[PDB]
Design a binder for this molecule. Structure first.
Ligand SMILES: Nc1ncnc2c1ncn2[C@@H]1O[C@H](CSCC[C@H](N)C(=O)O)[C@@H](O)[C@H]1O
Ligand SMILES: Cc1cc(C)c(S(=O)(=O)O)c(C)c1
Ligand SMILES: [Cl-]
Ligand SMILES: [Cl-]
Ligand SMILES: [Cl-]
Length: 235
């Protein structure tokens, strides 16, 4: 009934079942992460001068991926901006619940928004790749040993010149255990920029164009959140 009890249980079943535990949690209603809406820093970025420029330059066929989308609030948001958007989640339960929650969306109706039960690590990347990817409470959901393949998938998923937005949360310092794991921008950087081969200064695969403290974090997010925008390079 308590958040902590619910997190304790989520971590217990992740220990027994691995990644299969996520659909179990959704089936059983153990969804402590669920907020019922997007995080404000996403809307405020999109509505900022950098955000307007990003949306205004989008191609007519521009595609968005929202991985680990849960009930899909962020995917619905991007679809409402005119992006052909895919919300992907491992859990078939989560994906049905996303289709329920957004049942009235005009973009779900048109097919411009789509929710699909997909494993972020396994699904077939479209040939044209994604123009824009948004990661929130997905990187911090993964066990630490999966951060490196997450970065590698991100490098394959975002087209050259495309953009990845990571809302980095929770930044709780040295706290161990997860989900949610305590993350920071450095951890995201190391995953995204990958192997340095011969100890090469990171900057090989992405440019970190913007890294801010959002001025409109949710109250329990204040002091534990950064918004980072990454551009895919090595064209
Ligand atoms: N390999 C994987 N591929 C796609 N989704 C995954 C995944 N592993 C875990 N997930 C999903 O990641 C989510 C973590 S919590 C849901 C967070 C969501 N971004 C939100 O803000 O509401 C769960 O829904 C889980 O089903
Ligand atoms: C992946 C994940 C899981 C949980 C339990 C939480 S939360 O309970 O702290 O809100 C968050 C933010 C992300
Ligand atoms: Cl919303
Ligand atoms: Cl898949
Ligand atoms: Cl692939």
């Amino acid at each position: 009934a308590t958040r902590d009890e619910k997190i304790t249980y989520l971590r217990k079943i992740i220990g027994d079942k691995g990644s299969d535990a996520w659909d179990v949690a959704w089936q059983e209603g153990v969804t402590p992460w669920d907020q019922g809406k997007i995080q404000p820093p996403l809307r405020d970025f999109i509505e900022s001068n950098d955000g307007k420029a990003l949306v205004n330059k989008k191609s007519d066929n521009a595609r968005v991926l929202v991985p680990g989308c849960g009930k899909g609030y962020d995917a619905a948001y991007f679809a409402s901006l005119g992006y052909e958007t895919l919300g992907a989640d491992l859990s078939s339960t989560a994906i049905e619940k996303a289709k329920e929650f957004w049942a009235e969306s005009p973009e779900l109706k048109s097919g411009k928004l789509s929710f699909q039960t997909l494993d972020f690590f396994k699904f077939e990347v479209p040939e044209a790749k994604y123009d824009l990817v948004y990661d929130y409470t997905f990187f911090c959901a993964l066990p630490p040993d999966l951060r490196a393949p997450w970065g590698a998938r991100m490098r394959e998923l975002v087209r050259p010149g495309g953009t990845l937005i990571t809302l980095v949360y929770p930044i709780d310092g040295a706290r161990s255990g997860g989900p949610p794991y305590s993350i920071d921008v450095q951890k995201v950087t190391d995953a995204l920029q990958g192997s340095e081969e011969g100890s090469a200064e990171p900057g090989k695969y992405w440019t970190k164009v913007l890294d801010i403290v959002p001025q409109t974090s949710s109250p329990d997010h204040v002091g534990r959140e950064r918004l980072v925008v990454w551009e895919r390079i090595n064209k």
